[PDB]
Structure formats: structure tokens, C-alpha cells
Enzyme design. Structure first.
Site, PDB file in Angstrom:
ATOM      1  N   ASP A  33       0.797  -1.175   0.000  1.00 57.27           N
ATOM      2  CA  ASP A  33       0.000   0.000   0.000  1.00 57.27           C
ATOM      3  C   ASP A  33       0.854   1.258   0.000  1.00 57.27           C
ATOM      4  O   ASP A  33       1.833   1.357  -0.737  1.00 57.27           O
ATOM      5  CB  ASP A  33      -1.026  -0.133   1.147  1.00 57.27           C
ATOM      6  CG  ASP A  33      -2.283   0.708   1.111  1.00 57.27           C
ATOM      7  OD1 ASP A  33      -3.332   0.399   0.475  1.00 57.27           O
ATOM      8  OD2 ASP A  33      -2.064   1.723   1.815  1.00 57.27           O
ATOM      9  N   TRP A  34       0.468   2.226   0.813  1.00 57.20           N
ATOM     10  CA  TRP A  34       1.042   3.572   0.962  1.00 57.20           C
ATOM     11  C   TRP A  34       2.495   3.416   1.247  1.00 57.20           C
ATOM     12  O   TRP A  34       3.346   4.225   0.835  1.00 57.20           O
ATOM     13  CB  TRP A  34       0.221   4.604   1.803  1.00 57.20           C
ATOM     14  CG  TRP A  34      -0.749   5.401   0.985  1.00 57.20           C
ATOM     15  CD1 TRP A  34      -2.069   5.169   0.883  1.00 57.20           C
ATOM     16  CD2 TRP A  34      -0.474   6.557   0.175  1.00 57.20           C
ATOM     17  NE1 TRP A  34      -2.656   6.076   0.058  1.00 57.20           N
ATOM     18  CE2 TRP A  34      -1.712   6.946  -0.413  1.00 57.20           C
ATOM     19  CE3 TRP A  34       0.659   7.287  -0.153  1.00 57.20           C
ATOM     20  CZ2 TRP A  34      -1.840   8.039  -1.288  1.00 57.20           C
ATOM     21  CZ3 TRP A  34       0.539   8.376  -1.017  1.00 57.20           C
ATOM     22  CH2 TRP A  34      -0.677   8.738  -1.591  1.00 57.20           C
TER      23      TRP A  34
ATOM     24  N   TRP B 267     -13.648   1.087  -0.208  1.00 59.48           N
ATOM     25  CA  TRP B 267     -12.589   1.385   0.766  1.00 59.48           C
ATOM     26  C   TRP B 267     -12.486   2.873   1.160  1.00 59.48           C
ATOM     27  O   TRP B 267     -12.512   3.216   2.364  1.00 59.48           O
ATOM     28  CB  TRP B 267     -11.329   0.896   0.034  1.00 59.48           C
ATOM     29  CG  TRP B 267     -10.039   1.416   0.557  1.00 59.48           C
ATOM     30  CD1 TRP B 267      -9.437   2.604   0.284  1.00 59.48           C
ATOM     31  CD2 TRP B 267      -9.139   0.647   1.399  1.00 59.48           C
ATOM     32  NE1 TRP B 267      -8.205   2.618   0.927  1.00 59.48           N
ATOM     33  CE2 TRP B 267      -8.016   1.452   1.598  1.00 59.48           C
ATOM     34  CE3 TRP B 267      -9.214  -0.637   1.932  1.00 59.48           C
ATOM     35  CZ2 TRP B 267      -6.988   0.945   2.399  1.00 59.48           C
ATOM     36  CZ3 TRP B 267      -8.200  -1.103   2.718  1.00 59.48           C
ATOM     37  CH2 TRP B 267      -7.070  -0.314   2.954  1.00 59.48           C
TER      38      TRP B 267
ATOM     39  N   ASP C  16      -7.268  -9.583  -2.853  1.00 56.55           N
ATOM     40  CA  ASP C  16      -7.329  -8.118  -2.764  1.00 56.55           C
ATOM     41  C   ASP C  16      -8.108  -7.529  -3.959  1.00 56.55           C
ATOM     42  O   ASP C  16      -7.667  -7.853  -5.074  1.00 56.55           O
ATOM     43  CB  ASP C  16      -5.895  -7.506  -2.669  1.00 56.55           C
ATOM     44  CG  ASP C  16      -5.916  -6.019  -2.363  1.00 56.55           C
ATOM     45  OD1 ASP C  16      -6.976  -5.423  -2.055  1.00 56.55           O
ATOM     46  OD2 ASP C  16      -4.778  -5.445  -2.408  1.00 56.55           O
TER      47      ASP C  16
ATOM     48  N   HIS D  50      -5.844  -7.537   1.126  1.00 58.31           N
ATOM     49  CA  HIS D  50      -4.950  -6.393   0.950  1.00 58.31           C
ATOM     50  C   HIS D  50      -3.820  -6.375   1.978  1.00 58.31           C
ATOM     51  O   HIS D  50      -2.659  -6.085   1.675  1.00 58.31           O
ATOM     52  CB  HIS D  50      -5.767  -5.099   1.046  1.00 58.31           C
ATOM     53  CG  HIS D  50      -5.063  -3.834   0.760  1.00 58.31           C
ATOM     54  ND1 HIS D  50      -4.623  -3.518  -0.494  1.00 58.31           N
ATOM     55  CD2 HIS D  50      -4.806  -2.816   1.579  1.00 58.31           C
ATOM     56  CE1 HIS D  50      -4.080  -2.310  -0.436  1.00 58.31           C
ATOM     57  NE2 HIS D  50      -4.189  -1.885   0.799  1.00 58.31           N
TER      58      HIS D  50
HETATM   59 CL   LIG Z   1      -5.651   4.795   0.726  1.00 62.27          CL
END
Ligand SMILES: [Cl-]
Length: 310
Positions: free
Chosen positions: A124-125, A175, A260, A289
Site C-alpha cells: 500500500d502507501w 474502501w 485483494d 490487501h
Molecule cells: Cl488509501
């Protein structure tokens, strides 16, 4: 200068499986008055450093099943909490969080600790930000462990890195809706939805950093930055594609959380081609995820792949 708040320390008293001692830095350049927390585990003199970056809406607690495996391998592990998350300070206005704010905090941390021989661990981030770090000082990075993540490029250059924002309705759209709309966002409920195998105690460790909405600015801004990429993010992520395709000469290990809806295979196969030398991905059928929740398999396979070339 940045009005920020700090989560009361008692909120973390009762954490499940989080026996790591806190380390904090409050003197970063560009981050005046802000205290950042990060874990520093394993041998502080090891040659290898596993830099573990987390994403929305988590914290270093996410890496808790992987940290002890990397530490027992002989590596030093650094797992920082971004400001607005975990135990770091949290700016109160969403306007204060930008792609570069978080990116520059990472390069500052890295310089501040003088990390070398880095195995970057992203998802992710942590990967949106973390994948644009090596081109900034290639010599300090030597391996990559990438779980569901990509680059925040423009739609034209990589449609795969943009398509997921709009389709399907139950992927990123849901999300982002779950994160920015509720006036009363419960992170333990959010995590149990998006990471169905979490125990109640685990879910509750994710809500631990945020007593009320006022500590959630950081959490609300992230999704909006996936939706609205500013020029600097676009430029810098575009330029990282070139870095992975042509400049990158290290070892990579890829693990895909197959369930995911956000960044699964339609996004990970494409990423795998842009990363020079990346090998066949390790598909984990049951992971969503948060690949990290199935983290120990990932850590031991990565370390097995990595030893088989070192
Ligand atoms: Cl996000």
C-alpha cells in the site's frame, strides 16, 4: 508550526503481540516539533536493514508477525510509524499531509539513522511512497520485498495503476467510502471488514492510535490522495518507473494477496514487469490487501529466496 496532537500512551497498554520497545525522533529536518515513533529491532549493528513501511490506515503493528522473523535472521529491522498514525504525532489538518510531506519524512529518517544495505518492505502507501525512495540515493538500497502496491503515476502512462480507483464498486470505491465518509470512523470495525481473519484483540490494536476523529486527519487524507494525485506525486512516481525498469539491479521478492480487490493481480503483474529482475510472484491465495496478516510465510519465503542468491 504544524499544529499536531499526540495519542495518549495508555491507549497502547493492552496491545496483542506487540512487545517491541518504542524509539522516537523529534528533531527531523522539515519536521519541527513533531515526534515520530519507529521500531528498531534485532542487531543494531547488522549489515542488513529491513525498512518496513506500512500504509492506510495502519501502523507498524502491521509488521508484527514479520519483524521477529527478519530479526532472527540477523537483520536489523526499522519500522517507522508515519505521522498521523500509530505512535507518531498527528497533524490535525488534512491540508498538512501531502505525498512529499510523507516522502520527505522517510528520506529524513533514513538520513537521520544513516540506514545502509536496505531491504525495503512495502505494501500500500508504504509502497506508493517507498518505491520512489531508491532513485533518491540508490546506493543505500539493495533488496525489495513488495506486497500489493504500485506507483501513483497518471492514468495514461500506466492505466493499471489508475483503473482500480473506479472499478469495481466494492474495491477501492468502497474502501475510500468507508474511510472518508463516516463522521464516526471505527478502525477496528474497518479492519475486520478488510482483514476478515483478524482477532478482536488485533482489530482493536488498529483503533488504538485514534481515540476520536480529531486524531484521524492522516487517515482521511490518504485515500483522497489516491483519487487526486498532485503534480509532484505524478512526476516523482513517473520518474521511479524508469528507475525500477532500468537502474534497479538488486534482489526482489514479490508476494500477492490474491483476494485483494484493490491491488491484486491486475495491478501486481504489471508492476512485476516494470521491476527489473523481479521473479515469479508468490501468490498467497487466502490473503487480502493486508498481506502482512499472513506475514510470516512472506518473511520466510523472502529470506529463503534472498539466501538463494547471496
Ligand atoms: Cl488509501
Amino acid at each position: 508550526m504544524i499544529n499536531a496532537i499526540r495519542t495518549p500512551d495508555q491507549r497502547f497498554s493492552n496491545l496483542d503481540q506487540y512487545p517491541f520497545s518504542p524509539n522516537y525522533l523529534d528533531d527531523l529536518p522539515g519536521y519541527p516539533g513533531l515526534r515520530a515513533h519507529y521500531l528498531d529491532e534485532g542487531n543494531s549493528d547488522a549489515e542488513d536493514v529491513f525498512l518496513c513501511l506500512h500504509g492506510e490506515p495502519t501502523w507498524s503493528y502491521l509488521y508484527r508477525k514479520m519483524i521477529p522473523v527478519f530479526a532472527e535472521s540477523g537483520a536489523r529491522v526499522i519500522a517507522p510509524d508515519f505521522f498521523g498514525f500509530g505512535k507518531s504525532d498527528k497533524p490535525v489538518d488534512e491540508e498538512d499531509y501531502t505525498f512529499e510531506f510523507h516522502r520527505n519524512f522517510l528520506l529524513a529518517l533514513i538520513e537521520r539513522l544513516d540506514l545502509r544495505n536496505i531491504t525495503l518492505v512495502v505494501q500500500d502507501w508504504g509502497g506508493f511512497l517507498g518505491l520512489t525512495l531508491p532513485m533518491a540515493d540508490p546506493s543505500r538500497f539493495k533488496r525489495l520485498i513488495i506486497m500489493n502496491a504500485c506507483l501513483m503515476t497518471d492514468p495514461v502512462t500506466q492505466p493499471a495503476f489508475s483503473a482500480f480507483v473506479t472499478q469495481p464498486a466494492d474495491g477501492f470505491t468502497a474502501w475510500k467510502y468507508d474511510l472518508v465518509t463516516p463522521s464516526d470512523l471505527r478502525l477496528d470495525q474497518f479492519m475486520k471488514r478488510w482483514a476478515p481473519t483478524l482477532t478482536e484483540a488485533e482489530a482493536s490494536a488498529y483503533a488504538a492510535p485514534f481515540p476520536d476523529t480529531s486524531y484521524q486527519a492522516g487517515v482521511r487524507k490518504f485515500p483522497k490522495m489516491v483519487a487526486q494525485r498532485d503534480q509532484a506525486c505524478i512526476d516523482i512516481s513517473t520518474e521511479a518507473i524508469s528507475f525500477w525498469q532500468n537502474d534497479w539491479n538488486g534482489q526482489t521478492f514479490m508476494a500477492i494477496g490474491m483476494k485483494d480487490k484493490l491491488l491484486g493481480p491486475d495491478v501486481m503483474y504489471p508492476m512485476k514487469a516494470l521491476i527489473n529482475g523481479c521473479p515469479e510472484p508468490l501468490e498467497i491465495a487466502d490473503a487480502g490487501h493486508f498481506v502482512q496478516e499472513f506475514g510470516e510465510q512472506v518473511a520466510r519465503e523472502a529470506l529463503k529466496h534472498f539466501a538463494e542468491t547471496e
